[PDB]
Design a protein around this ligand. Structure first.
Ligand SMILES: Nc1ncnc2c1ncn2[C@@H]1O[C@H](COS(=O)(=O)NC(=O)C[C@H](N)c2ccccc2)[C@@H](O)[C@H]1O
Length: 396
């Protein structure tokens, strides 16, 4: 076992950073910023308000907000109250929003003034908390210390293949992720980390807690900054951001020379390409990161900074405390060179799919190699290379 904070919750790890780095910048959005102490206090105030409204272990709390500092306060508050959040994309079709609200059965939705009309337009019948109406400045600001377990729910991400399905992720996988980031990327409180992905895409979880579980600062990129490639490059350079994660298609539009500060560039979610990697791997640390939503992230490949061109782009090796099994249709293990289904075991596996027991049992099978554990069948095709890295080959 690679060490990590085995018994600690996500918010407990955040609180350790706020205690160690109270006056460091935690989060930036446009011309606003909050220190760790300020962010923690505001999240504690909201968390107490959420407790009074029934949030408890494995409660799912909907979030319908624009990306902003208050969006992150809402997330941390839900975790501190002992619950789990479900990010609901306010740009989805109304009927998809309604499906997620109704399927999740959430009894509380956190929103903002400019979004409250949409909440009414989807006919949501639960409790609605308009955060920029609430005056919480009077509430206690200290940490709550609610009961928590690593196996408690932390977030539910809806994805679609059929109808949307809620993928249930627990605290323990994100606690492991903290140690992965500190060990493998060397993340420290000095880093400045962009937030690029939608909060409905679990890459945003990776980005947000990359910053907030290590004392680093999280720079929430505005819509206009992302839309304009030169504005994006200027924003990263002016603010001296050190780490960013991007879709490969977005990265193809960027110029290394116009980004002066990055030490790590991660691409995730889609296949990268040898020409793309060769353009960046000798200017900074280029990382290809792979995973299904059902364990957030499973493998990483750091491209070699050796002034020699690569001809292909592996998805690399399992992250700490994650196991990869490449198997045939009978779940038998394959030798190097043989293509099979990529399956995953380890601490980051989702609990399953919300109120979908048969689908959960089909996809999160008994681990044939580790009695008493589960193994997730990704549906991705892959093979081991002779050097022990993994080549991604699409879908089985
Ligand atoms: N690096 C890849 N190369 C090539 N195909 C890929 C790759 N990363 C995913 N994929 C594909 O995308 C699927 C998962 O799609 S997803 O549920 O929308 N999640 C993501 O795309 C992001 C993923 N959860 C994640 C989050 C944070 C860090 C790393 C990865 C995988 O099963 C693969 O088919």
């Amino acid at each position: 076992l690679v060490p990590y904070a085995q018994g600690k919750s996500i918010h407990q790890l955040f609180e350790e950073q706020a205690e160690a780095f109270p006056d460091r910048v935690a989060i930036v959005f446009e011309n606003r910023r909050l220190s760790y102490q300020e962010l923690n206090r505001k999240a504690n105030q909201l968390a107490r308000a959420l407790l009074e409204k029934g949030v408890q272990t494995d409660s799912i709390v909907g979030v319908m907000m624009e990306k902003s500092i208050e969006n992150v306060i809402a997330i941390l508050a839900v975790l501190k109250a002992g619950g789990a959040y479900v990010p609901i994309d306010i740009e989805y079709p109304r009927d998809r929003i309604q499906y997620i609200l109704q399927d999740s059965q959430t009894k509380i939705v956190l929103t903002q003034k400019s979004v409250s009309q949409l909440v009414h337009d989807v006919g949501y019948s639960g409790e609605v908390v308009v955060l920029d109406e609430e005056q919480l400045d009077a509430r206690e600001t200290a940490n709550l210390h609610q009961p928590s377990k690593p196996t408690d729910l932390a977030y539910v991400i809806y994805t679609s293949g059929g109808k949307p399905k809620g993928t249930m992720l627990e605290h323990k996988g994100i606690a492991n992720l903290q140690s992965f980031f500190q060990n493998s990327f060397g993340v420290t409180e000095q880093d400045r980390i962009g937030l690029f992905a939608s909060m409905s895409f679990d890459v945003s979880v990776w980005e947000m807690f990359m910053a907030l579980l290590s004392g680093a600062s999280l720079y929430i990129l505005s819509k206009q900054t992302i839309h304009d490639f030169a504005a994006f490059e200027h924003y990263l350079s002016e603010n001296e951001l050190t780490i960013i994660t991007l879709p490969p298609t977005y990265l193809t539009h960027l110029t290394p020379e116009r980004i002066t500060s990055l030490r790590i560039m991660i691409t995730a979610g889609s296949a990268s390409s040898a020409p793309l990697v060769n353009k960046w791997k000798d200017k900074l640390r280029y990382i290809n990161a792979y995973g299904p939503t059902e364990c957030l992230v499973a493998t990483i490949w750091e491209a070699p900074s050796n002034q020699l061109s690569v001809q292909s782009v592996p998805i690399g090796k399992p992250i700490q405390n994650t196991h990869i099994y490449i198997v045939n249709e009978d779940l038998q293990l394959l030798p190097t060179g043989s293509e099979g289904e990529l399956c995953i075991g380890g601490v980051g596996l989702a609990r399953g799919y919300w109120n979908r027991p048969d689908l959960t049992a089909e996809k999160f099978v008994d681990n044939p190699f580790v009695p008493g554990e589960k193994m997730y069948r990704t549906g991705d095709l892959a093979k081991w290379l002779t050097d022990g890295t993994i080549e991604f080959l699409g879908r089985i």
